[PDB]
Every structure is written in structure tokens, then in C-alpha cells.
Swiss-Prot record:
It comes from the Eukaryota. All seven C2 domains associate with lipid membranes in a calcium-dependent manner. Domains C2 1 and 3 have the highest affinity for calcium, the C2 domain 1 seems to be largely unstructured in the absence of bound ligands. The C2 domain 1 from isoform 14 does not bind calcium in the absence of bound phospholipid. Residues 34-105 form the C2 domain. It is found in: Cell membrane, Sarcolemma; Cytoplasmic vesicle membrane; Cell membrane. The gene is DYSF. Key calcium ion sensor involved in the Ca(2+)-triggered synaptic vesicle-plasma membrane fusion. Plays a role in the sarcolemma repair mechanism of both skeletal muscle and cardiomyocytes that permits rapid resealing of membranes disrupted by mechanical stress. Changing V71D: In MMD1 and LGMDR2; Reduces calcium-sensitive phospholipid binding and interaction with AHNAK and AHNAK2. This is Dysferlin. Expressed in skeletal muscle, myoblast, myotube and in the syncytiotrophoblast (STB) of the placenta (at protein level). Ubiquitous. Highly expressed in skeletal muscle. Also found in heart, brain, spleen, intestine, placenta and at lower levels in liver, lung, kidney and pancreas. Signal peptide: none annotated. Changing D75A: Fails to bind calcium. Belongs to the ferlin family. Interacts with CACNA1S. Interacts with ANXA1; the interaction is Ca(2+)- and injury state-dependent. Interacts with ANXA2; the interaction is Ca(2+)- and injury state-dependent. Interacts with CACNA1S and PARVB. Interacts with TRIM72/MG53; interaction is required for transport to sites of cell injury during repair patch formation. Interacts with RIPOR2; this interaction occurs during early myogenic differentiation. Interacts with CAV3 and PARVB. Interacts with AHNAK; the interaction is direct and Ca(2+)-independent. Interacts with AHNAK2; the interaction is direct and Ca(2+)-independent.
Length: 128
């Protein structure tokens, strides 16, 4: 039998845009224990609804109180460097608390200096 960490990335809300006459093309990356996964790029939105699920094999290493999930949202640029919008570290401790094996988050997206951007991230996490 498999053991995995699962995340449903619902949506982000109230994303910032530095330049409003430039189309905003949000894309999110989720990293757990160094394994990075990405959503599709949503075009023309600052309130993107991905509704994408992600699974990480735990690889025989159990979750612990300190385990965390990192999500970054950027504004995609084809020529190349994507523009950083905001990020969150999601503490997974709550997932271990009850027999639900899960937790729900509505997390503020912060800039690299931890200043809240006004945007938020909606997601559910669970494990087996």
C-alpha cells in the first residue's frame, strides 16, 4: 500500500499586480521535501481557480510536527523569468492532530521579506 501527502490547491485570491495593463498569468509551484510540482498557468486573472490536486509519495519517511509545504505563486512570462507574486509556508502539523488525517488552510501570501501581499491561498491537505 502507498503512503502519500495530498494537497488540493483550490485557488488564490486578490493577487497583486505591479502593472495592471499587463495580463496576469498566475502559476503556482508546490514543494515538499524538495520535490516540486506545478499547476497549469491560468491566464488573465488575479483570482485564479486551479482546483488541482497533488500527491507526494512519502518514501517511507513519516510526517512529523515540523513538516511543511511551500507554495509560490508567480506571474508567468514566456520570455522567461516569471514574476514573483507571493508565497506561503504551510505548516502540516495540523494534519497529524486528528483521525481526519487532514487540514484546511486559507493562507496569506507573503513577499520575500514576509510582508503580507493581501492575497490568500486556499487549499486542503491530507495524508495516508
Amino acid at each position: 500500500i502507498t503512503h502519500m501527502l495530498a494537497c488540493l490547491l483550490v485557488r488564490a485570491s486578490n493577487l497583486p499586480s505591479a502593472k495592471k495593463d499587463r495580463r496576469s498569468d498566475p502559476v503556482a509551484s508546490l514543494t515538499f521535501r524538495g520535490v516540486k510540482k506545478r499547476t497549469k498557468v491560468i491566464k488573465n486573472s488575479v483570482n485564479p481557480v486551479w482546483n488541482e490536486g497533488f500527491e507526494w509519495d512519502l518514501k517511507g519517511i513519516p510526517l512529523d510536527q515540523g513538516s511543511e509545504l511551500h507554495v509560490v505563486v508567480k506571474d508567468h512570462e514566456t520570455m522567461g523569468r516569471n514574476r514573483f507574486l507571493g508565497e506561503a509556508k504551510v505548516p502540516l502539523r495540523e494534519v497529524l492532530a486528528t483521525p481526519s488525517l487532514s487540514a484546511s488552510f486559507n493562507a496569506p501570501l507573503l513577499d520575500t521579506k514576509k510582508q503580507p501581499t493581501g492575497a490568500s491561498l486556499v487549499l486542503q491537505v491530507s495524508y495516508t
